[PDB]
């Protein structure tokens, strides 16, 4: 749950930045494709966490919410940055 | 609430499946490109080595040649010298 | 119910263990490709340097051989001359 938190904080902080980065993209493409890549390798981390929430109902929910926000910025990027 | 709990887990499961699939595909491509490129360079090197050896041989034939060339100069000299002493000895 | 959630969690953990192993494996190959690829550069570059110094040596030997051929022609030419002061 100290790592559950770091995972989630990291995710939430970055979805924010990468989401803008994508929009502000219609040079820069360089810093961006890089973040997207890191954010892809965060999923395993979320998967493992989520699989580990022994009935901590609420902690589990925090994980999945983060996976949501993550999925959404990942879907955006694939559609726009193609 | 659980309905959404379950739904989102289900969504993760499909995501893990898709990602495991791409990752396994990628791993294979890498193993393929290693195998290919390994095989190529091996061949390239083999040619290079055959050529390199033809080259050693050629160089050795030139050493024989240059050696005879130095003998040529030495005979010519041995005559010249002999032949000078001998004009003195007349 | 819960089992649903518990049951998916166990499936997800199976998936994740598998994912992770496979990602580690890909990372390893990628590294390999990089190490070996860089080693090749070092190696190529040295071979290329040696080729270039070789070429320069062979040009010099060529110049030397030319000086020697001229030398022989020079020697010949006086020979022929003083084969006239005689066959005079």
From Swiss-Prot, chain A:
Where, subcellularly, is it found? Golgi apparatus, trans-Golgi network membrane; Endosome membrane; Early endosome membrane
Q: What's the impact of mutating residue 43 to A?
A: No effect on interaction with RABEP1
Cite the post-translational modification comment: Phosphorylated by CK2 and dephosphorylated by PP2A. Phosphorylation of GGA1 allows the internal DXXLL motif to bind the VHS domain and to inhibit the recognition of cargo signals. Ubiquitinated.
Changing residue 47 to A does what?
Abolishes interaction with RABEP1
- Variant or mutagenesis effect after changing residue 67 to S: Abolishes interaction with RABEP1
Q: What is the effect of changing residue 64 to A?
A: Abolishes interaction with RABEP1
Q: What is the effect of changing residue 43 to E?
A: Abolishes interaction with RABEP1 and UBC
- Substitution effect: residue 42 to K: Abolishes interaction with RABEP1
Could you tell me which cysteines form disulfide bridges?
none
Q: Tissue-wise, where is it found?
A: Ubiquitously expressed.
UniProt domain GAT: residue ranges: 1-82
Q: What do we know about how this protein assembles, alone or with others? A: Monomer. Interacts with GGA2 and GGA3. Binds to clathrin and activated ARFs, including ARF1, ARF5 and ARF6. Interacts with RABEP1. Interacts with RABGEF1. Interacts with the type-I membrane proteins LRP3, M6PR/CD-MPR and IGF2R/CI-MPR. Interacts (via N-terminal VHS domain) with SORL1/sorLA and SORT1 (via C-terminal cytosolic domain). Interacts with EPN4. Interacts with CCDC91. Interacts with HEATR5B/p200a. Interacts with SYNRG/gamma-synergin. Interacts (via GAE doamin) with NECAP1 and NECAP2. Interacts (via GAE domain) with AFTPH/aftiphilin. Interacts with TSG101 and UBC. Interacts with RNF11.
Give the UniProt family note. Answer: Belongs to the GGA protein family.
Q: What is known of its domains?
A: The VHS domain functions as a recognition module for sorting signals composed of an acidic cluster followed by two leucines (DXXLL motif).
Function according to Swiss-Prot or TrEMBL: Plays a role in protein sorting and trafficking between the trans-Golgi network (TGN) and endosomes. Mediates the ARF-dependent recruitment of clathrin to the TGN and binds ubiquitinated proteins and membrane cargo molecules with a cytosolic acidic cluster-dileucine (DXXLL) motif. Mediates export of the GPCR receptor ADRA2B to the cell surface. Required for targeting PKD1:PKD2 complex from the trans-Golgi network to the cilium membrane. Regulates retrograde transport of proteins such as phosphorylated form of BACE1 from endosomes to the trans-Golgi network.
Q: What is this protein called?
A: ADP-ribosylation factor-binding protein GGA1
Q: Which organism is it from?
A: Homo sapiens (Human)
**Covered range within the whole protein?**
211 to 299 of 639
Swiss-Prot record, chain B:
Localization per record: Cytoplasm; Early endosome; Recycling endosome; Cytoplasmic vesicle
The superkingdom of the source organism is Eukaryota
**Disulfide linkage:** none
PTM entry text? Proteolytic cleavage by caspases in apoptotic cells causes loss of endosome fusion activity.
Subunit comment for this entry? Homodimer when bound to RAB5A. Heterodimer with RABGEF1. The heterodimer binds RAB4A and RAB5A that have been activated by GTP-binding. Interacts with TSC2. Interacts with GGA1 (via GAE domain), GGA2 (via GAE domain) and GGA3 (via GAE domain). Interacts with AP1G1 (via GAE domain). Interacts with AP1G2 (via GAE domain). Interacts with ECPAS. Interacts with KCNH1. Interacts with PKD1 (via C-terminal domain) and GGA1; the interactions recruit PKD1:PKD2 complex to GGA1 and ARL3 at trans-Golgi network.
Q: What does this protein do?
A: Rab effector protein acting as linker between gamma-adaptin, RAB4A and RAB5A. Involved in endocytic membrane fusion and membrane trafficking of recycling endosomes. Involved in KCNH1 channels trafficking to and from the cell membrane. Stimulates RABGEF1 mediated nucleotide exchange on RAB5A. Mediates the traffic of PKD1:PKD2 complex from the endoplasmic reticulum through the Golgi to the cilium.
Q: What family is it from?
A: Belongs to the rabaptin family.
- Please state what the protein is called: Rab GTPase-binding effector protein 1
Gene name of the record = RABEP1
What stretch of the parent protein is included here? 552 to 641 of 862
